[PDB]
Every structure is written in C-alpha cells, then in structure tokens.
Amino acid sequence: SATPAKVPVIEWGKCEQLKPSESERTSKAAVVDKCLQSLPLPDPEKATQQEIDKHRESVTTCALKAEGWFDDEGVYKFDRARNEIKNKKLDSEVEEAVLLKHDACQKEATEKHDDYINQVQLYQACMDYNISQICGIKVMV
Amino acid sequence: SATPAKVPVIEWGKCEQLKPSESERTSKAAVVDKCLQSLPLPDPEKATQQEIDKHRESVTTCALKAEGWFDDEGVYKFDRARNEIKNKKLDSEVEEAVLLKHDACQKEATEKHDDYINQVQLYQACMDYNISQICGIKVMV
Ligand code: NA
C-alpha cells in the first residue's frame, strides 16, 4: 500500500496484560484528535525543534487533562495511576515490583520537579523504563 | 497513566480519506503481532544497527506479504496500490497529482533497485513524502 497503517511493534514479555485493547486505542485516538483541533501541528517547513517539542508537550497534557488525570490543585493523580496498574491483573510478582517502582518514580518526580507537568512527564518516563525492565518488554524504534 | 496508549498524531489536510479506519488499524496490529511470533525483536544489549534495520524491514515485508501485496515471483503489486489510491475517492485534483507521483515513485523504485523489497521500500518512502506534500498532511515524529 502507499498508505499503510502504522502500529506499535512490541513484545510484551511477562506483561501481556499491559497491551492496550482495540477499545483503549480508539479511545486515546479520539482524545488526541480532539486535542489537535485546538493545538494544530506546527508547520515542519517552518517550525523550530523547540516549537515542535513544546507542541508535543501540550498535546500530552491536553490528553491527560481531558481524561481526568489532574486534581483540583493541578496535581497528577498518582493514586489513580497506581489503581489502574492493579486493575491490569499482572502476575503477582510482577505487580509487586511494578507497584514498588510506582512509589520510586512518584518520589523521583516529586523531589526533582515542583512543576506539576514536569512531575507527570518524569513519572511517565520513569515508569516506561522500569515497567519495560521488569516485564522484559521490547519496543521497535 | 503509567501505561498510556501511543497513537499517531496526524493532521490529514485535504486527505481525511487516507486516515485508517479502526478496522484497518486492528487488522494491521493483528498482522504485526503474528509476524512477531516468528520475527522477534533483536536484544538491544547485543544487536547491531544492521540487525535492527534488517529486522524492521522483515516486519514490514511480513505484514505486506500477509495482506497479499506480492505476486508469486515476489514483485510488489504496484497496480493494486494504484487502484487502492483511486478507491480512496480523493478530490479529483489531489487524485491526479497523487497518481502522477505513484507512477513516478514506481519508476524510480524499479530503476534504482533490482531487489523487490528495496523497490517497495523506496516506493513507500517516495509516496509518504509526496502524498504528505500534496495533501498538506503533518505527522508528529
Ligand atoms: Na505502590
């Protein structure tokens, strides 16, 4: 095809439960597409890397805000994230290790950053890395 | 979320007709997941860039083969790709321009490369660039 669909290419290791469902994927696309209506993509013929990076940030924040991830003080809902991991029903030994890294990643994020957006950015990066390590997940880049 | 779904972030410009449906997206995931059961991701502790690149090429080949995109000799079905563009029902001026590029991308691919896989790789990159330009499509990297 001249227009192939692009999908993630991931081996889930010990953690097949973390693979998004078709439904979860369709949900997220709807959120992102709505965010893009207000946050159009920068012109790649003209945009600077900084403009691209800050626009990307704005879309990630939009999707988290639209789906309820910040409280009335603007703080990311770390306890919601924890409960969502428990709801995946990982194998018990993996769950325990992931939930310990949740605490470690929340601590790292909150001690490094006072900015609530920087906190969630570092927490998500921290969990992407640590979940990948615990689970043996490989992602094609 | 500690495990957000990752989705394309694209503005489709003049060419919303090219956005994959949920069905098309789900089929491509099913094909890629089946391809990975035989074409495992290389271990980044050990993998060369050549091994990583050749593995990525194999997944693309695998998914194209699963969907019927090669004849029995191994040649990519360029005329199928051409007819699939016409069946998108783009605006007439857009279609005209995209089909001129299809023919020119095919001719470049076959003149530059004798390897059938190299031919489809060049054609798809050529069409990604040219369809994006004609349509005004922006894709977040
Ligand atoms: Na915990």
Numbering used by the authors:
A (entry chain A), B (entry chain B): 7 to 147
Publication text:
In this work, we have explored the structure and function of such non-insect OBPs in the mite Varroa destructor, a major pest of honey bee. The overall folding, determined for VdesOBP1, is also novel and different from the conserved structure of insect OBPs, although some similar aspects can be recognised.
In contrast, the P21 form contains two molecules in the asymmetric unit forming a crystallographic dimer. The active site is empty, except in form P21 where a buffer molecule, 2-(N-cyclohexylamino)-ethane sulfonic acid (NCES), is docked against a wall of the binding site. Examination of the binding site in the crystallographic dimer revealed that the N-terminus of each monomer protrudes deeply in the binding site of the other monomer, drastically reducing its size. This effect explains the serendipitous binding of NCES as this ligand interacts with the cell wall of one monomer and the C-terminal extension of the other one.
